[PDB]
Design an enzyme around this catalytic site. Structure first.
Site, PDB file in Angstrom:
ATOM      1  N   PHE A   1     107.574  70.396  60.392  1.00 31.19           N
ATOM      2  CA  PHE A   1     108.682  70.597  59.479  1.00 31.19           C
ATOM      3  C   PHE A   1     109.096  72.063  59.445  1.00 31.19           C
ATOM      4  O   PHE A   1     108.271  72.960  59.611  1.00 31.19           O
ATOM      5  CB  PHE A   1     108.199  70.109  58.115  1.00 31.19           C
TER       6      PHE A   1
ATOM      7  N   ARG B   1     114.562  65.353  64.363  1.00 31.87           N
ATOM      8  CA  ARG B   1     115.292  65.225  63.111  1.00 31.87           C
ATOM      9  C   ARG B   1     115.916  66.556  62.743  1.00 31.87           C
ATOM     10  O   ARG B   1     115.224  67.575  62.698  1.00 31.87           O
ATOM     11  CB  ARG B   1     114.389  64.772  61.968  1.00 31.87           C
TER      12      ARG B   1
ATOM     13  N   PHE C   1     118.688  70.947  54.741  1.00 30.58           N
ATOM     14  CA  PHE C   1     117.335  70.534  54.393  1.00 30.58           C
ATOM     15  C   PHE C   1     116.268  71.036  55.354  1.00 30.58           C
ATOM     16  O   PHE C   1     115.269  71.610  54.910  1.00 30.58           O
ATOM     17  CB  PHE C   1     117.269  69.004  54.292  1.00 30.58           C
TER      18      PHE C   1
ATOM     19  N   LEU D   1     108.577  70.049  47.675  1.00 31.27           N
ATOM     20  CA  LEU D   1     107.515  69.731  48.613  1.00 31.27           C
ATOM     21  C   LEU D   1     106.261  70.558  48.379  1.00 31.27           C
ATOM     22  O   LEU D   1     105.314  70.457  49.165  1.00 31.27           O
ATOM     23  CB  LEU D   1     108.017  69.940  50.038  1.00 31.27           C
TER      24      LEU D   1
END
Lengths: 53, 157, 109, 75, 136, 328, 147
Positions: B104, B46, B51, B113
């Site tokens: 991540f 991803r 982001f 987050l």
């Protein structure tokens, strides 16, 4: 006869485009189709066709 | 207490500074997975521009990821670490206390987050490699059409 | 060198192909701009040096001789190829005017 | 030219009417850009140039754009 | 195998005029800007309390510091993007700026489009391949 | 890649009898006869072993440019410059179907290897995919801007490849009727295309240039260098002999894998011909690869065969692994 | 608007009769530029490019119309499009490097030259790029170009 002329002219033009070296200026090629017409008339009249140059 | 982890990818080399003082179990999980070679030839499945870049999945789908403490382990939300900017390493999780193997990594300040993701490092070198990894083209499900893989991950100390 | 250049131009007057015409036109256009302003080039170079140093893509280092050596971490100091921001060089109004006046002169001739 | 003269005289003396020569089987090239092909977007932004070009089109002035020895022995 | 080059280098005497002290015959208007090749040729964790970076200089080779409670930008703030009509600049497999977007603009994803010098090099000489499967 | 050895070819037989240029050739799938199509409006059937005239079929009003004999049906398909595409029933020697719709002269006709499908290409810039049974024109493959001069049909995608006098080759998805890819490498009009029988590659010919391509993606393989002519024809063996036949009468024989030209020659014009009438206009191998059939602008059919007495030491391969920079 | 509609009709009548004539396209686009209809002139240039995709003279006319009317970003988009379309036509590459040097973007000039060198052009283009670096004083960069 009109159809034969269309096919003949397309064939002569395709041959001339494929014969021309890359980079020669190529606007006047319809000029060669006029030479083709004149050569045909010369054949019909039994006149030798010889374009100098 | 910082440990270097080198991710040689297809777009350059990332050097990761791991925070052993703050998130020790997650950091040593990362060390052991990199040292075993669990990340070798593993893609970044991803990339979302401005982001995130996420990777570490050996299946390449986003549901896999097998940690060293069995399957999952708990969240370490140390209240001094926040997602303050680009290039910040965290553990991707399905929910709370579900940390596995996928990491991540923020490409931008993402301070929503906090309280649900465990910061356990940053990049010490390779921030432009990360930037261009953020600039690759993707599809509708954010997977990169142009393929990005960690060629080899190892440890430096 | 002058006379061999003149003789070459005389021999290269006649048309051969568009690659030669393009090379001749480019060389003549470079001559018609003339000598570059190396002072303005160097001012832009130093401004780019301090700006890229601030942006972290240039490292100012000192070797054993104690001199300023700049190191481009990427390769995007000198060329906007590989630069992600290559599409935001807005040119100077004087530069645009000079290019437009060049084209107007070509049109008039 | 004669029809233009008559239309100008009518417009000067008040009544304004749309003399429309639009035939049967002819497009209205004034009405719309015909078969419009926009330039492809590239890496450079052209929004400011598009806005300025639309400004120039709106402020175009047709009047401003209107106006544009030896001897025989030697021969 | 370089017999003629080796014979030339053997047959040539040493230059009787020394050149080891020679600077270049036309000087470069410095400062010198060179790369990590010429590098090769020629606060830490966890006591960053009070430290507060100002620039990508201070980030170094980048990376925000999560322990500092301020928003950081290792490569610069993004102001906005005021709906430009430009194509988004993308990168290729190994991180370079790609102009095949221009080549591929207006086609589908699976259209085969030759756009690079690499498509003009015979396949058996392309370095990325070693064994081509030519089977119907 | 070192070339394999191949014997030279030599002229075995000259067949006269057409009153026009021999523009189309098709060999029947059992290798007993072949059809020739010519500018005298005619299709002749010749016994291959004796070279002997079995039959003359009339039914085109212009030059026959394309011939195919079906391997699954007793049919021969003819296309011509009178815009007409005809199915001939060979059990009756009669035209039974037309595939009407090209706007001008039809230059090329191919049958699909596995489907009951015909593909033609013509001066109206398109390839037309016809259903053989219903005479239906199920696709107009559009996108060329010149005459579709030649065309091949494969059994796997890309199932149609067209080469055009706009200098461009297109590979086509036949199910959807769309272009998978455009090859713009040739500088002049693409007049000849051929696929390899046992490996998944093809060759394209324009003036002075033969390019080899890997299917399905159309990747460039190699150039066959040195035949400086308008190439009208390409033919390929299953023994990796590629023949290129040039409009000025010049012939080249190449090893297909390595690109090496093992033979160059010129054809000879039949007596009465002008020197302007030297030219290869059509070519095929027979079904076995042992005979090359050429149709020529001196109105002849010529049969060429390999030299049986040649030997790798009588005709050695004059190829050195060259070491220059081909500036591609 | 009456006169403009009449002229537009006669121009498109000649394009329908002979779309293959560049002068038909050229005179139509030049007239719209004179009327300051830049969207209309652009559309004419693009329809001409649909008929003549690989025509160097047409690409130069379009690029020069944008540059003359100071649409620098439009013109640079056209220059990228043109050297993508025709990467072995050195005229378009020379026009692009010349335009960037006129605009004073010497890094932009180096960018265009680097893309050209990727296409591996002829000796005149390699010489031109060496002479660019010698013009601006980078003899080490010119040394790299000789390598």
């Amino acid at each position: 006869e009109s159809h034969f002329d269309l096919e003949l002219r397309a064939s002569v033009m395709a041959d001339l485009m494929d014969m021309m070296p890359e980079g020669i200026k190529q606007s006047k090629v319809n000029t060669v189709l006029q030479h083709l017409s004149e050569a045909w008339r010369c054949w019909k009249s039994n006149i030798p066709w010889k374009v100098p140059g | 207490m910082a440990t270097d982890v080198a991710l040689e990818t297809t777009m350059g080399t990332i050097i990761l500074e791991l925070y052993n003082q703050h998130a020790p179990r997650t950091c040593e999980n990362f060390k052991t997975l990199a040292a075993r070679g669990y990340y070798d030839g593993t893609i970044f499945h991803r990339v979302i521009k401005d982001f995130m870049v996420q990777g570490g999945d050996p299946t390449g789908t986003g549901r896999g990821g097998r940690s060293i403490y069995g399957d999952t382990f708990e969240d370490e939300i140390h209240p001094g670490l926040r997602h303050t900017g680009a290039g910040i390493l965290s553990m991707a999780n399905a929910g709370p206390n579900t940390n596995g193997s996928q990491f991540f990594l923020t490409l931008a300040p993402t301070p929503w987050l906090d309280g649900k993701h465990t910061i356990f490092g940053r990049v010490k070198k390779g921030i432009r490699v990360l930037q261009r990894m953020g600039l690759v083209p993707t599809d509708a499900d954010d997977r990169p059409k142009t393929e990005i893989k960690i060629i080899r991950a190892y440890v430096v100390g | 060198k002058r006379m061999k250049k003149k003789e070459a131009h005389r021999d290269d007057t006649a048309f051969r192909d568009y690659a030669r015409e393009a090379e001749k036109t480019y060389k003549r256009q470079i001559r018609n701009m003339g000598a570059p302003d190396l002072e303005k080039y160097m001012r832009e170079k130093l401004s780019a040096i301090e700006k890229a140093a601030a942006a972290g893509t240039l490292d100012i280092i000192e070797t054993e001789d104690g001199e300023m050596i700049a190191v481009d971490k990427d390769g995007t100091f000198f060329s906007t190829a590989n630069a992600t921001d290559f599409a935001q060089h807005k040119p100077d109004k004087a530069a645009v005017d000079r290019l437009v006046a060049d084209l107007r002169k070509a049109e008039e001739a | 030219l004669a029809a233009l003269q008559k239309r100008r005289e009518l417009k000067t003396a008040g009544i304004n009417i749309k003399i429309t020569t639009r035939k049967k089987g002819q497009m209205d090239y004034n009405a719309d850009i015909p078969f419009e092909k926009k330039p492809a977007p590239g890496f450079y932004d052209t929004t400011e140039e598009i806005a300025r070009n639309e400004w120039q089109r709106a402020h175009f002035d047709p009047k401003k754009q209107q106006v544009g020895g030896p001897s025989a022995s030697l021969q | 195998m370089a017999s003629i080059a080796a014979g030339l280098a053997a047959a040539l005497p040493k230059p009787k005029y020394s050149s080891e002290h020679e600077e270049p015959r036309a000087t470069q208007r410095g400062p010198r800007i060179v790369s990590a090749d010429q590098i090769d040729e020629t606060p830490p964790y966890p006591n960053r309390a009070g430290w507060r970076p100002r620039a990508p200089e201070d980030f170094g080779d980048g990376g925000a510091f999560p322990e500092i409670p301020v928003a950081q930008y290792p490569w610069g703030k993004n102001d906005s993007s005021s709906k430009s009509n430009a194509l988004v600049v993308q990168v290729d497999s190994e991180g370079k700026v790609d102009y095949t977007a221009i080549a591929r603009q207006g086609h589908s994803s699976d259209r085969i489009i030759h756009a690079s010098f690499k498509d003009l090099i015979p396949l058996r000489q392309r370095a990325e391949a070693g064994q081509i499967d030519l089977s119907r | 890649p070192r070339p394999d050895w191949h014997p030279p070819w030599k002229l075995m037989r000259v067949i006269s009898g057409h009153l026009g240029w021999v523009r189309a050739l098709a060999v029947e799938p059992n290798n007993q006869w072949f059809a020739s199509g010519a500018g005298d409006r005619t299709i002749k059937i010749w016994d291959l072993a004796s070279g002997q005239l079995r039959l003359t079929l009339t039914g085109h009003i212009s030059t026959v440019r394309g011939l195919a004999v079906s391997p699954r049906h007793p049919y021969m398909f003819s296309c011509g410059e009178d815009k007409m595409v005809k199915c001939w029933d060979l059990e009756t020697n009669k035209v039974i179907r037309h595939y009407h719709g090209h706007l001008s002269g039809v230059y090329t006709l191919k049958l699909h290897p596995t489907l009951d499908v015909l593909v033609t290409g013509g001066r109206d810039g398109v390839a037309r995919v016809w259903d053989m049974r219903t005479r239906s024109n199920v696709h107009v493959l559009s996108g060329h801007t010149g005459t579709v001069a030649d065309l091949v049909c494969q059994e796997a995608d890309p199932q149609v490849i067209t080469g055009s006098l706009d200098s461009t080759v297109r590979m086509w998805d036949l199910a959807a009727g769309k272009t998978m890819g455009v090859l713009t490498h040739h500088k002049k009009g693409v007049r000849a295309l051929v696929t390899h029988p046992t490996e998944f590659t093809f060759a394209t010919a324009s003036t002075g240039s033969i390019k080899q391509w890997k299917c399905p993606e159309g990747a460039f393989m190699q150039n066959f260098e040195g035949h400086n002519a308008i190439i009208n024809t390409l033919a390929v063996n299953d023994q990796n002999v590629l023949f290129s036949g040039g409009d000025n009468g010049s012939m080249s024989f190449w090893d297909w894998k390595s690109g090496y030209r093992f033979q160059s020659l010129d054809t000879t014009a039949q007596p009465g011909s002008l020197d302007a009438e030297l030219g290869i206009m059509s070519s095929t191998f027979d079904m076995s690869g042992a005979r090359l059939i050429t149709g020529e602008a001196d109105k002849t059919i010529k049969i060429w065969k390999e030299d049986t007495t040649a030997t790798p030491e009588t005709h050695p391969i004059e190829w050195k692994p060259s070491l220059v920079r081909r500036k591609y | 608007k009456e006169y403009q509609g009449r002229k537009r009709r006669e121009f498109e009548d000649y394009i329908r009769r002979n779309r293959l004539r560049l002068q038909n396209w050229f005179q139509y686009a030049q007239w719209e530029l004179e009327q300051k209809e830049f969207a209309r002139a652009r559309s004419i240039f693009e329809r001409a490019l649909d008929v003549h995709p690989n025509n160097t003279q047409l690409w130069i006319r379009y690029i020069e119309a944008e540059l003359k009317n100071r649409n620098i970003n439009h013109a640079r988009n056209l220059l990228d499009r043109a050297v993508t379309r025709l990467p072995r036509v050195s005229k378009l590459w020379y026009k692009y490097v010349y335009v960037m040097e006129m605009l004073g973007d010497i890094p932009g000039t180096r960018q265009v030259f680097d893309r050209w060198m990727k296409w591996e052009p002829d000796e005149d283009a390699w010489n031109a790029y060496i002479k660019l670096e010698k013009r601006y004083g980078e003899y080490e960069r010119a040394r790299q170009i000789f390598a």
